[PDB]
């Protein structure tokens, strides 16, 4: 169990630690760390919730629905907080393509992978800090999809992150 705290994930921003910068986020208000589903679950319109019961409100998609963190292209530091550390296989990061439609349901086919970090089947610390590169053809509202792949189960934790690239 874990979430991306910086830039705050859509789920994290639903919690008090995230400033309640997103409202009406279901279970994300209290447990943004709990978005767990089998690896390679990428159901269109169910990316933000990973199809998990109680997280459905996260799946709404419009240009203005969610709070964005202002970022630039180039290097971006990602910080996870893990409420329950687990042996780790992988960390993968995707971002929406230039030209994507922010008023349509999220579809993984409209993202590119932009980073992949081997967890080496080790147990990470409670705070995990990684740097990824944001491609320079992205401007404006984009969604980053951060996926923590568990080493000793068939599951992953899924974190949609709303950013404004300027
Ligand atoms: Cu867990």
Curated annotation (Swiss-Prot):
Pfam name, any one: LPMO_10
Subcellular location: Secreted
GO annotation, cellular component aspect: extracellular region
Span of domain Chitin-binding type-4: 1-163
Taxonomy, superkingdom: Bacteria
Required cofactor(s): Cu(2+)
Chain positions recorded as Cu cation binding sites: 1, 86
InterPro entries: Cellulose/chitin-bd_N (IPR004302), GlcNAc_Chitin_IntDeg (IPR051024), Ig_E-set (IPR014756)
First-listed, main subcellular location of the protein, grouped into a coarse class: secreted
SUPFAM superfamilies the UniProt entry points to: E set domains
Entry's cofactor comment: The copper metal center seems to be reduced from a Cu(II) to Cu(I) oxidation state prior to binding of dioxygen for catalysis.
Metabolic or biological pathway: Glycan degradation; chitin degradation
Gene Ontology molecular functions: chitin binding; copper ion binding; monooxygenase activity
UniProt catalytic activity: [(1->4)-N-acetyl-beta-D-glucosaminyl]n+m + reduced acceptor + O2 = [(1->4)-N-acetyl-beta-D-glucosaminyl]m-1-(1->4)-2-(acetylamino)-2-deoxy-D-glucono-1,5-lactone + [(1->4)-N-acetyl-beta-D-glucosaminyl]n + acceptor + H2O
Keywords for this protein: Carbohydrate metabolism, Chitin degradation, Chitin-binding, Copper, Metal-binding, Oxidoreductase, Polysaccharide degradation, Secreted, Signal
Job of this protein: Involved in chitin degradation. Catalyzes the oxidative cleavage of glycosidic bonds in both alpha- and beta-chitin via a copper-dependent mechanism, leading to oxidized chitooligosaccharides with a dominance of even-numbered products. Acts synergistically with the chitinase EfChi18A, and combining the two enzymes leads to rapid and complete depolymerization of crystalline chitin, especially with beta-chitin as a substrate. Is likely involved in a chitin degradation pathway that allows E.faecalis V583 to grow on chitin as a carbon source.
Protein name: Lytic chitin monooxygenase
Organism listed in the record: Enterococcus faecalis (strain ATCC 700802 / V583)
């Amino acid at each position: 169990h874990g979430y991306v705290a910086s830039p705050g994930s859509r789920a994290f921003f639903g919690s008090s630690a995230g400033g309640n910068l997103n409202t009406n986020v279901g279970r994300a208000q209290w447990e943004p760390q709990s978005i767990e589903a089998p690896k390679n679950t990428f159901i269109t319109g169910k990316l933000a919730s990973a199809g998990v019961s109680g997280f459905e409100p996260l799946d709404e998609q419009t240009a203005t629905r969610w709070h964005k963190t202002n970022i630039t292209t180039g290097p971006l530091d990602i910080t996870w907080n893990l409420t329950a550390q687990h042996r780790t296989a992988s960390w993968d990061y995707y971002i929406t393509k230039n030209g994507w439609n922010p008023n349509q349901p999220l579809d993984i086919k409209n993202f590119d992978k932009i980073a992949s970090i081997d967890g080496k089947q080790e147990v990470p610390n409670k705070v995990v800090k990684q740097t990824i590169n944001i491609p320079t053809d992205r401007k404006g509202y984009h969604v980053i999809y951060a996926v923590w792949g568990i080493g000793d189960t068939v599951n992953a934790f899924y974190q949609a992150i709303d950013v404004n690239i300027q």
